[PDB]
């Protein structure tokens, strides 16, 4: 599976591709 | 957070399911 330094929209895309229609949480430091 | 695992380093799909319903 893809884990190669995915960041922002690419990490949201990987988290969606694992989770599917179940739904997930996401966060980033500011 | 998930970016502090999958963007700073390499992670896993089982660490992605940690954030799933």
UniProtKB/Swiss-Prot annotation, chain B:
Coiled coil: none annotated. Disulfide bonds join 6-11. This is Insulin A chain. It comes from Homo sapiens (Human). The chain holds residues 90 to 110 of 110 of the full protein.
């Amino acid at each position: 599976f893809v884990n190669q330094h995915l960041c922002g929209s690419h990490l949201v895309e990987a988290l969606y591709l694992v989770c599917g229609e179940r739904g997930f949480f996401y966060t980033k430091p500011t | 957070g998930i970016v502090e695992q999958c963007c700073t380093s390499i992670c896993s799909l089982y660490q992605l399911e940690n954030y799933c319903n």
